[PDB]
Design a protein around this ligand. Structure first.
Ligand SMILES: [Zn+2]
Ligand SMILES: [Zn+2]
Ligand SMILES: [Zn+2]
Ligand SMILES: [Zn+2]
Ligand SMILES: [Zn+2]
Ligand SMILES: [Zn+2]
Ligand SMILES: [Zn+2]
Ligand SMILES: [Zn+2]
Lengths: 441, 439
């Protein structure tokens, strides 16, 4: 079976149905819009208060489509925020591919992060690539018993790693109207608009020069004419042959090429009296051939389209990588320039260190000899000032004089300072503007 | 009026003696060297074990001069370590002058950091610059009754902030030999070498003569140039030394010929016809001359110590110059790298601009492509639904008119990739010749 599907915003659109009026689930909580949980209390006024909290105006329990989809985007983004914020389901969230992360966001949006935080052992089996055990363990839960359809679909999407389980449903819902999503079996008269959507006779809205003749499709809001809509002749059984319009109880069996209208016997002899004709078998086979050719071509063009689409996604990834490339290579190049400059500076300080260690060594030696001179001079001075004691110290003149005569000094070569670096900062303020940003060309 | 000291940490050399043999402390402990406390136990063999552990060689309980002074420097550096390590006496250490700091180091050397950390009440008085209170409170400490001499000297140096209290001792010790620190009385016979140091007759080296090395400054002199210290007969007793060759008649005459105090027998022989000089007249004259010489030397010494201080200032200035050079180089390098980082940020900003523009274009194009893909999937799902054999032919018009809608993948230019394009060759060359270092 041939399946066609989108990605992840769609899936929340397929699982839940859009209702702009406040509604109670047959067994659940008061919700509104597209699966927006207002409150869990039974009181309607509480639900309306939470409604006005979400909208900001008094609505009286009725919303509009744009506001419902704004709340939808808010709810989905908040669910993913509550996923990445929670510390117990994030490590298992990171290791999954887009599709399973996708399914998990759906599960959290339906039951809440705390609701899915209870399913410990199924998550422990899912993180480690043990799929089937997780599926069967997930089947036994209240979430499965309340809404078994959605639960089975989400479990299947976890199992397969593809959106096919919803693609199949997209095809199934193709037999249901796009408004109230009821089965278009002919009780309510089905209608098929030129946009190839199907609806009920009551789900068309309202439905004097001009009263109608113009109608907006309820799902895609593409304008078409009231005459171009035909009853969905496809929902007829599960007889095949339809009876003629003007000719009651008289089946159609000829195809008029003049009027291009499938016709009845009496019609193509009276009305289409001189028109062309084809026996139904040959014309039906012909048109089936043509439409099969068109669908093959459309499938080919769509395949090439999505291939080019993913190539463009790859191209945006690559432009972001190019941006990182340029920025980090510039940072590292300038860092290398500053590194070679710091190396030059560290080698330069060594020269000041050498000259200063030399001069300081000479002056330190000079200071040492000067301290020795000072000390032994003080000694001579005390011993000579010891002439105060009245005595016949004449017998000690020779030692006291000739040693008092000890006068000496030293000397070192006076040197100049080297404190200026003498950098030409003008050259560097000019050289700062030497920035090249080439291109691939 | 004789303050001459002008030193820094010889004060420990003046307070504590030098002993190459083990000696018993004033406290009764086993000590050696220059006030190095080995242990407080009475047993000597423990003292010899700690000594050989500290010295490193087999000593047999006796050390030499240079290694003892090695231990002196070692102990002083360890005392300063124990000062800067302790958190009770470091804040009080910083607020002191160099001299008062030397005094604190002396106290730590004598009693230990834990010993001086106990005088908390008095220590806090030092950092508040209340000197007299600190002096009086320290004067009544256990340390004062134990070793009152060193305590009085250190307390005077703390009170005054000068080395005067040690200059006095420096002059007092002038009457003691520089070796065994005994009082130079008539016994223990003093001798005065030409280097103007004084020693005992026994402290001039043990068993080649007529040449002898001074025991304290190790200056070579002759065993004949040494004269007995004629200056120290204050004790007891009239007191004139007798002639050299004539062992019985004293020298009372002064010859102007030889400038030598002479005896009368020597006047009969040698200075037979010389000019002589009266007693007082010669002594007063030579006293005048030597006073003039000491004036000259004192002035020269004052200017000398001034030059010494100034030279220390110059060696500080060269270190300040070194710090200046290194920090100015660092700051210049940082400043250029700052403006370089700024230019880099502006270039990255331009790259961000171009890339975000291209990204917006490709994102909206991808959105329209997703729209097309979904609309095509819808048409295809409804058309591939022709499998049910039926009168779908009564629906031809709708299936074809919408099936024929094929449209508009709407392209854009692939933008060239942006590389770097720097010139590190030329720029590392210009980086390698930035330095001047002019004088
Ligand atoms: Zn409906
Ligand atoms: Zn439509
Ligand atoms: Zn008819
Ligand atoms: Zn016709
Ligand atoms: Zn002696
Ligand atoms: Zn000497
Ligand atoms: Zn004479
Ligand atoms: Zn004589």
């Amino acid at each position: 079976n041939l399946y066609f599907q989108g990605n992840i915003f769609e899936m929340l659109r397929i699982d839940e149905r859009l209702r702009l009026k406040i509604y109670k689930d047959t067994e659940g909580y008061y919700t509104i819009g597209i699966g927006h949980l207002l409150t869990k209390s039974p009181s309607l006024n509480a639900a309306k208060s939470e409604l006005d909290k979400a909208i900001g105006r008094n609505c009286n329990g009725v919303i509009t489509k744009d506001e419902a989809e704004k709340l939808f985007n808010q709810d989905v983004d908040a669910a993913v925020r509550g996923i990445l914020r929670n510390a117990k389901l994030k490590p298992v969230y990171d290791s999954l591919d887009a599709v399973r992360r996708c399914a998990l966001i759906n599960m959290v949006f339906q039951m809440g992060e705390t609701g899915v935080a209870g399913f410990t052992n199924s998550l422990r089996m899912l993180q480690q690539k043990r799929w089937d055990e997780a599926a069967v363990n997930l089947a036994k839960s209240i979430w499965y018993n309340q809404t078994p359809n959605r639960a089975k679909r989400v479990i299947t999407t976890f199992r397969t790693g593809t959106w096919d389980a919803y693609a199949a449903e997209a095809l199934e819902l193709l037999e249901h109207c796009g408004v109230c999503r009821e089965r278009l079996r002919p009780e309510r008269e089905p209608r098929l608009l030129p946009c190839l959507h199907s609806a009920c006779s009551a789900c068309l809205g309202p439905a004097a020069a001009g009263d109608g003749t113009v109608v907006d499709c309820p799902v895609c809001k593409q304008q078409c004419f009231s005459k171009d809509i035909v009853e969905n002749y496809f929902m007829r059984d599960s007889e095949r042959t339809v009876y003629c319009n003007v000719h009651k109880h008289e089946p159609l069996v000829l195809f008029c090429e003049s009027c291009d209208t499938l016709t009845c016997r009496d019609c193509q002899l009276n009305a289409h009296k001189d028109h062309q004709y084809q026996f139904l078998e040959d014309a039906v086979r012909n048109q089936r051939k043509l439409l099969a050719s068109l669908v093959k071509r459309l499938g080919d063009k769509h395949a090439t389209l999505q291939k080019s689409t993913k190539e463009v996604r790859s191209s945006i990834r690559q432009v972001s990588d190019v941006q990182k490339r340029v920025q980090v290579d510039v940072k590292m190049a300038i860092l290398q320039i500053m590194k070679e400059l710091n190396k030059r500076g560290r080698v330069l300080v060594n020269d000041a260190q050498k000259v200063t260690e030399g001069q300081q060594e000479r002056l330190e030696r000079q200071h040492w000899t000067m301290t020795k001179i000072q000390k032994h001079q003080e000694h001579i001075l005390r011993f000579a000032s010891w002439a105060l004691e009245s005595d016949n110290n004449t017998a000690l003149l020779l030692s006291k004089k000739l040693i008092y005569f000890q006068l000496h000094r030293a000397l070192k070569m006076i040197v100049d300072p080297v404190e200026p670096h003498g950098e030409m900062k003008f050259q560097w303020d000019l050289n700062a503007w030497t920035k090249s940003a080439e291109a691939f060309g």
